[PDB]
Symmetry: D3
């Protein structure tokens, strides 16, 4: 209880959530997910105009932390995936404007957290992969579809393949590519856009714009991770060469 896997910088127009496990590729431990949920909930209570998501170290996030998954039960793993989806839905449906800034190699729920944010930028060298369908996981699927279209989503998710910054830009997954040196200016621009409307009107606008399939998404996640043999499917995937 003395670590800080999530750093939160609070300013009047913006809170910045820095995933802070840089020796573990910002992988989502149960502790980090719970910290994110708490932070996001607090920001919604305080009607923070802009939430910024970033990662310390070499990347944004490698997604689910598979360290010691062998010593966790099938139930333990299901709970952690459910809490991840609950987090993603809170970020996706936020009354705050949300901004994500990705760099390095990003994976799974890490990419989904990025996807849940409305303004999305990455470094020209950044990379993304959502490989979970290889072990039967159905996470972030419809949200990714809503962004890039069903054709591109099938192409990418169906073969559980990587895609780079250029491809991410082409398919509309990122607004633009931007070096880390340009990130402070992007945050300022996002802060200005977020505060252009009052909290109640901003929340209403977000609610009106969003395609809400939260229940379908959570059901699909729950079913996928609750199929008997989840742990074995993970084991098989992690033993695979690429």
């Amino acid at each position: 209880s003395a670590s800080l896997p999530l750093a939160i910088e609070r300013r009047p127009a913006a809170w910045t959530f820095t995933l802070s496990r840089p020796e573990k590729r910002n992988a989502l431990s149960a502790e980090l997910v719970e910290a994110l949920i708490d932070g996001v909930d607090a920001a919604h209570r305080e009607q923070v105009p802009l939430l910024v998501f970033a990662g310390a170290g070499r990347n944004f996030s490698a997604g689910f932390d598979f360290t010691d998954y062998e010593t966790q039960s099938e139930g333990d793993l299901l709970l952690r995936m459910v809490r991840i989806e609950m987090l993603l839905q809170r970020v996706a449906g936020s009354p705050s404007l949300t901004l994500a800034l990705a760099h390095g190699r990003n994976f799974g729920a890490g990419v989904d957290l990025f996807a849940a944010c409305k303004w999305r930028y990455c470094t020209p060298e950044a990379g993304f992969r959502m490989p979970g369908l290889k072990f039967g996981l159905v996470l972030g699927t419809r949200r990714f579809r809503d962004i890039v279209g069903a054709d591109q989503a099938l192409s990418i998710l169906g073969s559980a393949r990587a895609f780079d910054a250029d491809e991410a830009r082409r398919i509309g997954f990122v607004r633009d590519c931007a070096a880390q040196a340009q990130w402070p200016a992007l945050i300022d621009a996002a802060a200005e856009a977020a505060t252009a409307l009052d909290p109640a009107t901003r929340a209403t606008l977000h609610r009106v714009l969003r395609d809400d399939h939260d229940d379908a998404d959570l059901a699909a996640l729950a079913r996928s991770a609750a199929q008997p043999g989840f742990k074995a499917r993970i084991r098989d995937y992690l033993a695979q060469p690429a």
Copy 2:
């Protein structure tokens, strides 16, 4: 040590008998998996009629809380998800489904009963879905669809018991029937189930059903995944 489930296979019907007499037919993970396996097998074979009953003194006491203190929050979530996956399989069955209740029934046990299309109980039977007392949202909309939003709020809102007479009044059971009359009900049900060709029976059930499976599973998952689940169970089990 006997198996927690007995399955009997006839041409027109399979009977699933819950058999945990020291545990009030409570749903262990093993029993739920046995039921899922059994119902899945029945569906592959297109068995016209599935019958659900309990050996001993009741239909079912729902989730088995034995040693819940030694299971993780995630273990308990998974078992609850698996129960809902079972309920949805039974509720959406292409087979005709019949449930026969007696004694005192609770929680997921009552929900399993509710998931069946033909529902009968002894005149002395009782039911309670107390799960909302520990924040659990299980079977809520399916119960609403049976009894109406008004009766559902009356019963679930206070998480209270109801007896066979109220169950009949509100449409929760078609009628009451003593255990001695059950083999005859099963025969009437098997005749009903084979009155239409299997594809037509399947179509009829699909056409009639109000499908909110995703909303149901999402609400279940959210409810059981809130931090402090075990502690809420603990507090309920004390009162």
Copy 3:
């Protein structure tokens, strides 16, 4: 001799099925006459549409006379047009009243079901046996009236039900002898004209559970499955 008689008064049009030597069975001609008549009434914004049958009954439904000489496609088309008729009546901005007597079958019962005010003679009978030959017609609209439990029992066994059972389950408002019928029509004409045409249309729209597309799709699928004529043949042989 035309198969349909239409009486036009200012507040009400009365559609009298006029094939009393053929049990008022729905030939393609009768169904088109009905569609044309109902469409005309809708253009005129007639407050009340009344449906009745000359002779011994309301209607025996689909006319199976010479079905063997009609193609699988001809039969599908006739069923589709029946459903399009039923949807026009069910969704009418007019108030609708149906008056049944004698023995009534299938699409005949569905036409009756599509009307908002439903009355029959104490001796009237109803049967919807279409599921016996795989036909899915009027299923959801019947469910909306009597509830999924009662619809499953009646449709899933294709049983005939009487006026007493019809009243019990809410399928008719009440039983009334043919002598009480003109007063019922008068009462309906008054209720129909109690609101202005635009507001009446709005109320009907706001109150209705619309699943017209799901119903037409299910009908079309059910009747277009290869071997339709053969399923009808096996049915028409039964007990």
Copy 4:
């Protein structure tokens, strides 16, 4: 003199409509007072909201006093605020209880209908006449309570109904003399507090048929039609 009294106890807030010389008619001020009070209760997560009327009745609905000095826009705005209040009550996380007596009209009946537990005195009456002047207010909520059949009967002829009919059609839980009202409030307070605040909220959300947007849209279209004030004038005119 204020048009609304609010009594706050630990488990309940009681909103007493307090315009007994004006039949508790809903002025713009009373509607806003009700909205502010209901919003405050929602922020406080009060288990139970009780609605009652001082004097001879529960409420006579929209206050048509000096409507001639109101523009059509003024009337639209007031109707919109009424619907917003009705939707806040109907969708409340609190248990809601309404206790009616005397003769009640329009939006008054709709406020009553928005509450989950509804009781009236043996001599209480109800009438929703707004469709006579083209108003579409509370229509679907009333339908959801009594069924499309009874809703059409009552709303389609914009007719009165007494306590006996209200009980028969499920519009009230029971008829109860005012002497029995303190015990009913106590029972409602017990029922409301049987679940924790978050769970009670989730239950209410899960059980409710939410068509708030269709309801507000229908209301707005009805009251924004050119000539709406003139239709009111015609309906209210004294000869």
Copy 5:
């Protein structure tokens, strides 16, 4: 009255609705909105294949007319906004093909009227802004999103900002940037497309293609404009 705030040219294939308050930037008074509703209803009854919308003078439309809003009640303002949304829904759901031709600087409900038309063109120098969210108004939101996508809708609506003709073309809001010299040829093409199908089939196609969220749109509009303090929010915005 004797003014003609809306001119309607009628031809067998097409009716052209010219907004004709060029000294008031074609702003939508209650009278102009009612004229438009009457005209669009008449066209529906008469099964006109193509409806063309254009503005006289320097622009298409400046949206809601705020002249003497101070002397109108909060209710009067809600009513006028409700009528505008009802108009927009009638245009958006029209069995006719609809064509809008914009120029100059356009605002609010004027941009929404433009958006309600299926084929849309503007001059290279045209500008658009939907600023109403600055005073809490929720008008045309879902319809704009359906055209340009949630991402671009948020980029524009989230800061209630202007966008020019180049941006409009990029985001798919207009078919092309076309000078008024091109407009006769474009109307000709639209009239040809409109009459390619019979009236019943054209109506069916339009219904099948449209994402109908009319009730949610009207509810969101009504709630936004009925919030106590509406007139004051308008006052604040106009002062900026």
Copy 6:
């Protein structure tokens, strides 16, 4: 004719290839061909074939509904054939298999809709497409087309009941890319690999989750349009147009 083979089926472990084989009739969909396609697609679904490939022998993919003996057929016969076509299209569009279509030549109506029902869609640079059925009141494939190309482009094409070429098809996202026939074996191999990247159950779930299901609305719209009295006369008038 029982000795004829209007549909050739090639069966391999990862892929079945359905080759429409009426090259003297522009691969037009007779009742027999539609029934053969339904039978074949149903069999593949039972056998959980990872990939279905659709192709046409001769000069094209398919000219849609075979009008050859329409005068000798009743209104009911024509309705039934159209309904069975929509049932086929819905089976293909909702397939748990990955689906690939390879178009060449001039294609029409239900032929273009069969192509549209497939997830991976490629055509030669010379391929042409037209869905003219709205000219005779037919409402077939309308919503699925809209879902692929967007309401704007769908209105531009269907509102005029007009042809569109391969360039336009690529531009609007109707085809993944233009590819000449020499590149087709490699595309099929790539498709088979993509199809087998996930296990059968997960593949089926991904497709289910990605798809916008409006099957009932689609079949209702089709049935209404083709059941309107005077259908055959509308067809006659359209076929007389020069």
